[PDB]
Structure 1
Amino acid sequence: GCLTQLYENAFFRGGDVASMYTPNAQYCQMRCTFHPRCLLFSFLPASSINDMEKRFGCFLKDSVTGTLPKVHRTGAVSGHSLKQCGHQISACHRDIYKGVDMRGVNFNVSKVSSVEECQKRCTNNIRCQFFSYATQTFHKAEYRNNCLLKYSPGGTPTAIKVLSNVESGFSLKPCALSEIGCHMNIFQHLAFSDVDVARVLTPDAFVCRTICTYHPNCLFFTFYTNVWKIESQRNVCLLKTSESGTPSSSTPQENTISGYSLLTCKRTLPEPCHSKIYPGVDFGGEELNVTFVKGVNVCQETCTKMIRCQFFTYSLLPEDCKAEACKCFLRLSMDGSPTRIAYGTQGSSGYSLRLCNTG
């Protein structure tokens, strides 16, 4: 189940699924937690490695066996995802990092009085994922008190530099501290355009909204329903953003459903798991394991315990059943979502609850 233990002076080797820059090991672990395939991570603080462009390196990893070889390396930090850790799963990261410049796409500069006022500007700008603030002591005078609001692919810095008198941090939007509004609207028969940042398959628009909420680049979405006119585009969840952070257009379109990320929401933030069981539906994906169980609910329990299981299909086809048990197909994909969603089947599909952090 839940493994919070960290491993000092350790670097996991191989199994790499994604890498990025993060300011510390706790942030790297959080990105591991929310990456659909990450089980293990290794982090390199600036002190731990000579190579410049490997400092602050955060390496997300997977293993069919849940274990990997590791080497001793002084100062490196390794650990697990917080999958299956309930309330410890959080997107909230409050830390101000002093003497650090988290680099990205600068879309906003102003002069501010303190780092916490810079943090506030970032938190209340919908496009800001992280910021950098140069203090009154900063060596170059023109930049003193500059507050830079930034974003980047995946919401992690494209570089992190050790730099005196610069203070960086992330938006507190995922800490429910934004004054940006929470928009629960679901628009029937309505599509957005702008810029597509990801594409997955979802059984309904509500799953699509939840994925958008926790995807670092998604501000709004358009879901194409199972009765959408183009067969190959059925159940397509289009995650989107725009230059301003707001949709620049909207198009009435039958069998399309659109809405917003809910990450600004407080009382009504959806948790990062999808609990609904979907009768009559097959979820395509890589087979992880086939077990015989009594009823869809135990099949979901079985997926949830199998930490690498992302979603499941419990079949009632006669060829998949025997004396008082039917087969539970445990599955996974590259992105956490089904590779195909097929209707009119004798099977009930659902998701792992490994990331539920409520209830």
Structure 2
Amino acid sequence: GCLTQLYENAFFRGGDVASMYTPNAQYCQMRCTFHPRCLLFSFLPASSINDMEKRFGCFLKDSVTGTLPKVHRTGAVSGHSLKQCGHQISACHRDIYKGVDMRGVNFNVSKVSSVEECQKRCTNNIRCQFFSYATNNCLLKYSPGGTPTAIKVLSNVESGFSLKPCALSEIGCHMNIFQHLAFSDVDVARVLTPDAFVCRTICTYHPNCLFFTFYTNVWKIESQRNVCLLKTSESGTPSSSTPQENTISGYSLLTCKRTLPEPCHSKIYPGVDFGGEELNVTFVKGVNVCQETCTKMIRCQFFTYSLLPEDCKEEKCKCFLRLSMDGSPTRIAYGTQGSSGYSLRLCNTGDVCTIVGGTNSSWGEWPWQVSLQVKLTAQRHLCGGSLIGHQWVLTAAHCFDGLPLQDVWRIYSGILNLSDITKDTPFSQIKEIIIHQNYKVSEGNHDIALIKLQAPLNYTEFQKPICLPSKGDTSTIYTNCWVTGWGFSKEKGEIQNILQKVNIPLVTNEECQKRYQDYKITQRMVCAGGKDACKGDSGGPLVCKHNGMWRLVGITSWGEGCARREQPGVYTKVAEYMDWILEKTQSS
């Protein structure tokens, strides 16, 4: 099961399967998440340890129990992989580190006006993995495994990673595969795959893979059948291509914006066995059950469901759960009674999960944010909203006051600049509106409504759901809460074109009551406050970053003016409507 909690001042003892340098702990957790064996990680900031070569140190760990001895160590951050965490799994990491120099193979040097300009050049260079900017020349870099070979504290250097895996690369996306055609170049790794697309997906998430050649099982040389060769080159593109019977080549799809493959392989393969280390064997009823059994057991990486009469009892046959060192079968045999497949633990396309005084946001920064517009005499943006599921958006009830809740509404998602919206821009239409039963147009109670879209949305890195809060467990005092929208930047201002963001401290429910003596601030409301949500931000998100994670805490509802001194914003408190949410939303 998904496990997002972190452990402060804590180091896990032993169990190392890999280690590298990473700029912070969440980056290390992402490495853990994508490593085939990592369940647990411990990270050491520059302050925590005094062994120079351990600083910025990221240690990836496995354990047959799923647990390891935990030792106290001031400043060390331990935690879990995000395997099994669905759409919270993400290869994208846009943080820029001030005062930090991440080192590697410097292969390209330029002069640019800002760190941002440097990040962009890295992002658009097929070979760039991370970069460093000084203060103004710009260094693009790669390294073994994509992590820096060293990380040093230098006050006037900023560093960050290519935003390629955030879908921001202008580099092309190449969906073409080439039949009977082999690449040469630099082989960076070699694994067995059942077909070419699995191999292409492994290439896409492999740090140093830019293209691949796969060898089918009809391949002349028997010992090389099903070999998937991950490759790269200095230029980043193949320098030759050789015609070759029974040979399939293609490219990493990491630059692809809307065809980025999921980092799991969900096809079932009849007549094939996947060899590996045996982890557990049990009698389940059919291949699908066997695959779920593998997905729920986190150390399982792939399986074979046997169909030999000797391996079946009554409707139930042996389900061989297996793993290997690198996540791929150690053998693939093609004449067997039964079917093989992979664990879905890393699938991230989901099933729902558990502005005055701000600055420009960046594309995909807030991927759950939507704009709710109305086609009346003109089309206009009225409210924000939060994507919480393929078909579901959460917003404010008052957005529909006296409004013809029919074929008038158009929901926009995955969008940063409203001015970019033309009548050809794709949009979601409303299939159904769920205003809270106890809502009333002239009162602020239960300011919340669901919207079922007429079609489900595909999750991308610029369009995906925010997670909701766990139970009524808001005893936790959130410290890093933010609010976004295209609303008025001042009282009596205008709608903004570029989605805005602001960091607002939360307030107490009694202190908030003290400042609105004319209304009743209730338990089901949460308050927060020269910086505020304003007109047109209605219904948008109030998000809090907990354990490096983002939670949806409030729905922008109301305030007296905008950004008025000691009159804070009132948000519908999401914790207190989970019952109704999950209710209306897990049905129909």
Which of the five TM-score ranges fits, normalised by the shorter chain?
Answer: over 0.9
Post-superposition offset of 1:347: 1.4
Aligned to 1:138: none
**Counterpart-to-counterpart distance in 2, 1:353 and 1:345:** 23
Post-superposition offset of 1:199: 0.3
**Counterpart-to-counterpart distance in 1, 2:238 and 2:116:** 29
**Counterpart-to-counterpart distance in 1, 2:288 and 2:105:** 45
**Counterpart-to-counterpart distance in 2, 1:32 and 1:288:** 20
Post-superposition offset of 1:44: 0.2
Aligned to 1:157: 148
**Counterpart-to-counterpart distance in 2, 1:307 and 1:165:** 43
Q: Unpaired segments of 5 or more residues in structure 1?
A: 134-144
Post-superposition offset of 1:343: 0.2
Post-superposition offset of 1:129: 0.2
**Secondary structure of the structure 2 residue equivalent to 1:345:** coil
Post-superposition offset of 1:146: 1.2
**Counterpart-to-counterpart distance in 1, 2:98 and 2:290:** 48
**Secondary structure of the structure 1 residue equivalent to 2:76:** strand
Aligned to 1:140: none
**Secondary structure of the structure 1 residue equivalent to 2:237:** coil
Give deviations 1:176-195, integer Å, cap 9, x for gaps.
00000000011000000000
**Counterpart-to-counterpart distance in 1, 2:39 and 2:228:** 25
Give deviations 1:262-288, integer Å, cap 9, x for gaps.
000011000000000000000000000
Post-superposition offset of 1:324: 2.4
Query: Are 1:348 and 2:339 counterparts?
Result: yes
Q: 1:267 aligns with which of 246, 251, 258?
A: 258
Post-superposition offset of 1:70: 1.3
Aligned residues: 348
Runs (4+) of structure 1 moved beyond 4 Å?
A: none
Query: Are 1:244 and 2:244 counterparts?
Result: no
Give deviations 1:221-250, integer Å, cap 9, x for gaps.
000000000000000000000011110000
Aligned to 2:292: 301
Aligned to 2:380: none
Post-superposition offset of 1:323: 2.2
Post-superposition offset of 1:328: 0.1
**Counterpart-to-counterpart distance in 1, 2:35 and 2:41:** 11
**Counterpart-to-counterpart distance in 1, 2:245 and 2:72:** 58
**Counterpart-to-counterpart distance in 2, 1:17 and 1:315:** 31
**Counterpart-to-counterpart distance in 2, 1:19 and 1:70:** 18
**Counterpart-to-counterpart distance in 2, 1:331 and 1:53:** 36
The CA RMSD over aligned residues, in Å, is 1.5
Question: When you count strand as a share of all residues, which structure comes out higher?
Answer: 1
Aligned to 2:493: none
**Counterpart-to-counterpart distance in 1, 2:86 and 2:289:** 19
Post-superposition offset of 1:55: 0.1
**Counterpart-to-counterpart distance in 2, 1:106 and 1:13:** 35
**Secondary structure of the structure 2 residue equivalent to 1:307:** coil
> Relative contact order (C-alpha < 8 Å, sep 6+): which is higher?
1
**Secondary structure of the structure 1 residue equivalent to 2:334:** strand
Give deviations 1:88-109, integer Å, cap 9, x for gaps.
0000000000000000000001
**Counterpart-to-counterpart distance in 1, 2:217 and 2:6:** 44
Post-superposition offset of 1:309: 0.2
**Secondary structure of the structure 1 residue equivalent to 2:335:** strand
Give deviations 1:63-122, integer Å, cap 9, x for gaps.
000000111000000000000000000000000000000000000011111100000000
Give deviations 1:17-61, integer Å, cap 9, x for gaps.
000000000000000000000000000000100010100000000
Post-superposition offset of 1:207: 0.1
Query: Are 1:75 and 2:66 counterparts?
Result: no
1:167-316 paired onto structure 2 within 5 Å: 167-316=158-307
Post-superposition offset of 1:318: 1.2
**Secondary structure of the structure 2 residue equivalent to 1:74:** coil
**Counterpart-to-counterpart distance in 1, 2:181 and 2:123:** 29
Post-superposition offset of 1:336: 0.3
**Secondary structure of the structure 1 residue equivalent to 2:218:** coil
- Structure with bigger gyration radius: 2
Q: TM-score, normalised by structure 1?
A: 0.96
Post-superposition offset of 1:290: 0.2
Q: Unpaired segments of 5 or more residues in structure 2?
A: 349-586
**Counterpart-to-counterpart distance in 2, 1:147 and 1:220:** 27
Give deviations 1:206-232, integer Å, cap 9, x for gaps.
000000000000000000000000000
